[PDB]
Design a protein around this ligand. Structure first.
Ligand SMILES: c1ccc(CN[C@@H]2CCNC2)cc1
Ligand SMILES: c1ccc(CN[C@H]2CCNC2)cc1
Length: 460
């Protein structure tokens, strides 16, 4: 049986509004309704992995697993295996996979983060799952962020606390947060960002939704505007939105948005908004293609509509050679030339690099760089040709060109990372000096850049 080089992944997010679901929810898993929908000719074709995030979920794990598995069996005639399930309060993630993938999936990891302090600790946060699919690491985060149109900054803070504190993926990647630990990271949920228009415009917004004039409303979506200002979700991608706002509906119809302030809303307006979102971040030069992104029209138990997204995701095989794993392959090497980091820090310490990759037997520390002042105030840390030569475990270019090197720049004084990035080895040429580049982040915020040249030797 050949190992796959692509899988398809279903992501769902649904804030259930503390109500049980209706008897049929298959339109969700079939990507049918509004937006970018899946072709009818694919309806019997199972996705490889289904990741279901709920918020305000009233069901037990058992109750929801029975609904999910029976739903997928009806659609596909496949009995899916449960990879993982994790619940924090009423926030839940379920991962299901086709039975043929059971012996491809390993290193399963679950975690949660509770957001807020005192008043604001008690029901928001995130759950996540990670695992390996053969040679590819996959991460999934379902977050329910702070509600309310005037709390976008709180949502951004919630996001930072989640990516700092969620402990998924390889713990040996100690300098790296979840935004660097996975070949593919999917982050979805009731992110709760709103269409920021005046309350008086509520009926105008509804008009525009009825006319399917979404681009105009999207120019005021707080998640797009905060992302464009680099306040949140830096270096993530979202498909274009072509479906109506998924919140806030009257229950048992989709004909009516319930936006007016009520005691039950804390006297807050809920103008129609795209609360419910799917974003992703994949390592450079890996295949990832969004093939659906939309909302259902026929599931009406909640004041939110479910959202679906589906993806093609490149995956790699487990690789065994006569040499690595268990030793190095002397026919392989990775050389960094003429490298320098540009940092935004005002601190004066020396810095060194750490190189992490599953193509190395263990992480590699460089010598300290040479600090200089940039012509616009910046710290520049020069490594020249001083960086260690990296010795991969496997030299076969069918393996090595698919790998990635994570880089941390660390203070000699504290050994704390000031910035993290990622370099793909999917080069235009081997045995050739080629430019490389990554932005550097810390806690998901831009802290600098790393650039230089690489020279990759493979066995070919
Ligand atoms: C929100 C809106 C627009 C953007 C910029 N576009 C991407 C830059 C790299 N590729 C496209 C980021 C966030
Ligand atoms: C669903 C998918 C994967 C798994 C774990 N499989 C690993 C242990 C045995 N071989 C690999 C359990 C449930």
């Amino acid at each position: 049986q050949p190992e796959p080089d692509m899988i398809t992944i279903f992501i769902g997010t649904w804030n259930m509004g503390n109500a049980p679901p209706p008897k049929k929810i298959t339109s969700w898993f079939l990507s049918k309704g509004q937006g970018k929908t899946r072709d009818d000719s694919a309806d019997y074709i199972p996705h490889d992995i289904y990741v279901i995030g709920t918020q305000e979920d009233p069901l037990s794990e058992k109750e929801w697993l029975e609904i999910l598995k029976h739903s997928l069996q009806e659609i596909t005639s496949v009995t899916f295996k449960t990879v993982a399930i994790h619940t924090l309060w009423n926030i839940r993630i379920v991962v299901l996979a086709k039975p043929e993938h059971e012996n491809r999936i390993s290193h399963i990891c679950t975690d949660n983060v509770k957001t807020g302090i005192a008043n604001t600790l008690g029901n928001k946060g995130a759950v996540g799952v990670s695992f390996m699919f053969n040679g590819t690491s996959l991460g999934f985060v379902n977050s329910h962020l702070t509600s309310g149109s005037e709390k976008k900054l709180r949502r951004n803070q919630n996001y930072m606390n989640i990516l700092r504190f969620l402990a998924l993926g390889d713990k040996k990647l100690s300098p790296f947060n979840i935004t660097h630990r996975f070949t593919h990271l999917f982050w979805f949920g009731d992110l709760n960002y709103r269409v920021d228009l005046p309350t008086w415009e509520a009926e105008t917004i509804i008009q525009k939704i009825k006319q399917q004039q979404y681009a105009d409303l999207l120019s005021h979506d707080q998640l797009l505007t905060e992302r464009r200002e680099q306040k949140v979700f830096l270096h993530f991608e979202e498909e274009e939105i072509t479906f109506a706002p998924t919140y806030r509906f009257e229950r048992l119809t989709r004909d009516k948005y319930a936006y007016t302030k009520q005691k039950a809303t804390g006297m807050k307006y809920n103008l129609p908004s795209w609360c419910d979102r799917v974003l992703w971040k994949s390592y450079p030069l890996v295949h990832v293609v969004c093939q659906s992104y939309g909302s259902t029209s026929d599931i009406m138990t909640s004041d939110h509509s479910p959202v679906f997204a589906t993806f093609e995701a490149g995956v790699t095989s487990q690789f065994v050679s006569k040499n690595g794993p268990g030793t190095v392959d002397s026919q392989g090497q990775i050389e960094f030339l003429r490298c320098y980091a540009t940092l935004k820090t005002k601190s004066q310490t020396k810095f060194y690099l750490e190189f992490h990759s599953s193509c190395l037997e263990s992480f590699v520390k460089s010598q300290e760089g040479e600090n200089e002042e940039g012509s616009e105030g910046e710290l520049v840390v020069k490594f020249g040709e001083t960086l260690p030569k990296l010795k991969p475990i496997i030299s076969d270019p069918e393996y090595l060109l698919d790998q990635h090197i994570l880089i941390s720049i660390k203070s000699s004084d504290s050994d704390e990372s000031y910035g993290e990035g990622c370099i793909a080895l999917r080069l235009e040429a081997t045995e050739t000096q080629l430019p490389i580049y990554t932005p550097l982040t810390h806690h998901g915020e831009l802290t600098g850049h790393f650039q230089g040249e690489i020279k990759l030797q493979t066995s070919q």
